[PDB]
Amino acid sequence: LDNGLARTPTMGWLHWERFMCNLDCQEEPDSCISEKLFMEMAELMVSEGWKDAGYEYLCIDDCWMAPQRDSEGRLQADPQRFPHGIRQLANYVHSKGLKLGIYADVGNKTCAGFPGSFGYYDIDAQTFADWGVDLLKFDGCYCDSLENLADGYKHMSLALNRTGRSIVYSCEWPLYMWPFQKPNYTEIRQYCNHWRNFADIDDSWKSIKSILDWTSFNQERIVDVAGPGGWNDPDMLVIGNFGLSWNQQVTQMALWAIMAAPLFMSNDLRHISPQAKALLQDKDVIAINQDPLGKQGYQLRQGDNFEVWERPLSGLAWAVAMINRQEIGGPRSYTIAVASLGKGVACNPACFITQLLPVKRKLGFYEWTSRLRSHINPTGTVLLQLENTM
Amino acid sequence: LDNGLARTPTMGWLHWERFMCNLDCQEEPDSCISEKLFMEMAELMVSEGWKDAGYEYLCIDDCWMAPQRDSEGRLQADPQRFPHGIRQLANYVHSKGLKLGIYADVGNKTCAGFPGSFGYYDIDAQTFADWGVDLLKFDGCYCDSLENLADGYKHMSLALNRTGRSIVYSCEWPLYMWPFQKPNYTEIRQYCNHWRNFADIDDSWKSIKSILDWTSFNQERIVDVAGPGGWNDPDMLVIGNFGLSWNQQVTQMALWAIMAAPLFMSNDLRHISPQAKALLQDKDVIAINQDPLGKQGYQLRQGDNFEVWERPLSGLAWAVAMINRQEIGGPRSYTIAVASLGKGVACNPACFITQLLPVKRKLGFYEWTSRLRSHINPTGTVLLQLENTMQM
Ligand SMILES: *[C@@H]1O[C@H](CO)[C@@H](O[C@@H]2O[C@H](CO)[C@@H](O[C@@H]3O[C@H](CO[C@H]4O[C@H](CO)[C@@H](O)[C@H](O)[C@@H]4O)[C@@H](O)[C@H](O[C@H]4O[C@H](CO)[C@@H](O)[C@H](O)[C@@H]4O[C@H]4O[C@H](CO)[C@@H](O)[C@H](O)[C@@H]4O)[C@@H]3O)[C@H](O)[C@H]2NC(C)=O)[C@H](O)[C@H]1NC(C)=O
Ligand SMILES: *[C@@H]1O[C@H](CO)[C@@H](O[C@@H]2O[C@H](CO)[C@@H](O[C@@H]3O[C@H](CO)[C@@H](O)[C@H](O)[C@@H]3O)[C@H](O)[C@H]2NC(C)=O)[C@H](O)[C@H]1NC(C)=O
Ligand SMILES: *[C@@H]1O[C@H](CO)[C@@H](O[C@@H]2O[C@H](CO)[C@@H](O[C@@H]3O[C@H](CO)[C@@H](O)[C@H](O)[C@@H]3O)[C@H](O)[C@H]2NC(C)=O)[C@H](O)[C@H]1NC(C)=O
Ligand SMILES: *[C@@H]1O[C@H](CO)[C@@H](O[C@@H]2O[C@H](CO)[C@@H](O[C@@H]3O[C@H](CO)[C@@H](O)[C@H](O)[C@@H]3O)[C@H](O)[C@H]2NC(C)=O)[C@H](O)[C@H]1NC(C)=O
Ligand SMILES: *[C@@H]1O[C@H](CO)[C@@H](O[C@@H]2O[C@H](CO)[C@@H](O)[C@H](O)[C@H]2NC(C)=O)[C@H](O)[C@H]1NC(C)=O
Ligand SMILES: *[C@@H]1O[C@H](CO)[C@@H](O[C@@H]2O[C@H](CO)[C@@H](O)[C@H](O)[C@H]2NC(C)=O)[C@H](O)[C@H]1NC(C)=O
Ligand SMILES: *[C@H]1[C@H](O)[C@@H](O)[C@@H](O)[C@@H](CO)[C@@H]1OS(=O)(=O)O
Ligand SMILES: *[C@H]1[C@H](O)[C@@H](O)[C@@H](O)[C@@H](CO)[C@@H]1OS(=O)(=O)O
């Protein structure tokens, strides 16, 4: 989407995976979908170094809406859970130097069953613009035809543009289409800053493996369309929650960097281990995700329960990720000719290799003739940066 | 098995899940199955508090053997990887205050393809005894028929007995029967100090879920046969490795205590986080696993991706485990009438409740009529100890 936004993949925080549709503010005031939750996260994004590391969009997912539109036909914030309303929440988030994301649905209801935007695309767009919203995530539920799905995603895209406000447009057009026909990604990119391809992430290693496996299977169709203003969205970072080992968290952070994914944390910034925080705030790894060239990486190889992925970077650098998919035993040895990496140019005539994950370690100078040898933890990833000597 | 051993579930370390059948000492020396791996593991069991906590048995799994029996038809330690032999490793292990486990197979070859024990039960049993072996793990690969399987396990049991050495006998008889017919656990219990029921664990939450789901589904068949001298074996603790979140690790330790499981760590004691170490050495959870009453716990309730397990302990005390099987969102609230726990006994007329996992927290006096309110992490477990009391 040529709106001048998402020139690098969008970074921030989204409530869905961790906080879901929790409407019980009486029995659970700290966990419920409320403006207090979003203000708490806004304060911590400033105070705990998130904004400084580049996490900039504080995003509301589903279940923020009143059950009905107003007399004037507009979407409303739940009067109890969002009593000051979205415009006022946007004002607070802006005062902290952050941006606000909100959620709507292309169909007749949101997925969780609140007002759909079908019939209301123009008003909803102008409502969001008036409220000071900086990002829209547009989910795909309760849409009766591919025709309505396409027209809706395009119509909301054009309606956002016409408001005159810079609003990042996050689409789920491919995801909701894929069961019925192959999406046209060239067309999707013309209308969307990023697009969900695949099933919702959850707090599990199974979920991460299924996202990587879908992405490597479909890479011919999706890798080349990605670039400044338009990204494949493999869904939220779940680092800092309950379901992932350290090595599985490292795999998610490393491969979300290789894939030039939007980095939307869905965690509790009030309760996050130092280790999870330092991984998510990892400057070198965010610098890979945020590389201004914006060329999506890809799977180079798969065999013997190993994966090699690589991403071309600015200035003749490459990122290389090596995944151990064997979930038994100890750190497993993998070796690859450096001449096989970055299409033959990364290490011709030589490259300096730095390991970034699981720990930062200079590995030294590798000649074009060299083999890189590494031990990779089960369900873990080794992330390397290659700098060509020339 | 009435050999006076395994009156509580056996505790120790077994190499299999973490080191497997790594024979490449040239290119993977730190991972390979060698005497030096076992010697170094023995030193760390002493120096890093493992023996103190109850982990007493240092056990060799498959791939210790020479490819062939000697001229006198006895088994041989691999000459390159075990050049000083089992006898001397047994001496080293005994010198540190620990006991040595070894492995063999009821059939013609070990599962990894080394010399099987069929035709040699008596000589192999005497070999282990002369060697100073304190435990045998006996896999089921390469067995012709149920008659051979059953005949072998029964044979090796009496063979080990006929040596007059105390040797914990660890059988996979049930596990290698399931593809043919349902096991008879009273027979198995007569011959074996513990028995593998289900497929090998690996370093994954999927593996843990699969072992717990098989256990709860099958609990009426297996829970009551367990007791001092004979235990259900749900396979090794894999805490300290790579595949489990903190919450999934707490779930394994909590539920292995509930199930009166033998506790065989399969990890690298040279490279283990303080957090995994503190969980595996947790005195209060080991004390549940090792409760002298020795009655195996069970799943009380399932529904809404929650599980409630409980285990009766000596002295009218109960352990209660609450598992959140929802792999999304945040900590979920679960409430239950204390009356519904410990068959209504635990908290009649009151109990004192101590949370043990994920952290140790005195919760206080609960009257028989009162409710217990908890919050359980996704893939995590809250483990509680209920002490029957007359106070409050
Ligand atoms: C080869 O196979 C045979 C059986 O096939 C096996 O022999 C059996 O060995 C076991 C284990 O030692 C024997 O069990 C012990 O039996 C003695 C004697 O029991 C009889 O006589 C007593 C006299 O006191 C009577 O009261 C009783 O009713 C019996 O008729 C008992 O003294 C032993 O009990 C102690 O240990 C038990 C655990 O095994 C406890 O349950 C019990 O409470 C006892 O106390 C324990 O804890 C105490 C804590 O203070 C501690 O102080 C004690 O020292 C002890 O640890 C036990 O029941 C069984 O009798 C043998 N059976 C037969 C048929 O001979 C061989 O052992 C086996 N050989 C090898 C090497 O594998
Ligand atoms: C509404 O849709 C139009 C059509 O794409 C958007 O126009 C495009 O806007 C971008 C971003 O401003 C333009 O590129 C930029 O040009 C400026 C000024 O020269 C430059 O400084 C930037 O570095 C960048 O190259 C882009 O050329 C332009 N396209 C067209 C056809 O005019 C517009 O941004 C959208 N507006 C909103 C509110 O979304
Ligand atoms: C949101 O809900 C509305 C109202 O239920 C949907 O409008 C209805 O959509 C159906 C298509 O499935 C239309 O039915 C068609 O009508 C013609 C006759 O005019 C008939 O030949 C077709 O076979 C079919 O039955 C229906 O006319 C239409 N109703 C109105 C009031 O417009 C709407 O499509 C839903 N939107 C999404 C995105 O699901
Ligand atoms: C380990 O391998 C040995 C060598 O193959 C096995 O010994 C064999 O045992 C089988 C019984 O399952 C014997 O088969 C029978 O042979 C007789 C005729 O000799 C026939 O009447 C029967 O109908 C049946 O075919 C076999 O004879 C015997 N060995 C040899 C060399 O003939 C042994 O069973 C294996 N052990 C285990 C525990 O699996
Ligand atoms: C996929 O979608 C794209 C964009 O809508 C289509 O490409 C356009 O096709 C028309 C007719 O060939 C051209 O006028 C435009 O130049 C194209 N736009 C761009 C930027 O390429 C393409 O036709 C669609 N492909 C398929 C197979 O349907
Ligand atoms: C399982 O095996 C055990 C032990 O071999 C059997 O126990 C026998 O039970 C009968 C009574 O039905 C006793 O009279 C015997 O003395 C017991 N022992 C033996 C060695 O036979 C048990 O019956 C078997 N269970 C089933 C259902 O087959
Ligand atoms: C649509 C999105 O795919 C998901 O990320 C989230 O925004 C919810 C909101 O309701 C919805 O997915 S769901 O699978 O229908 O819950
Ligand atoms: C048999 C046991 O079940 C397992 O724990 C281990 O001891 C190996 C030894 O080779 C074997 O299982 S396997 O699935 O055949 O590897």
UniProtKB/Swiss-Prot annotation, chain B:
Changing residue 329 to S: In FD; loss of enzyme activity. Its main location: other. Changing residue 16 to G: In FD; decreased alpha-galactosidase activity. Changing residue 35 to Q: In FD; has 52% of wild-type activity. Changing residue 325 to P: In FD; loss of enzyme activity. Substrate binds at residues 172-176. Changing residue 299 to R: In FD; uncertain significance; decreased enzyme activity. This is Alpha-galactosidase A. It comes from Homo sapiens. The lineage of its organism: Eukaryota, Metazoa, Chordata, Craniata, Vertebrata.
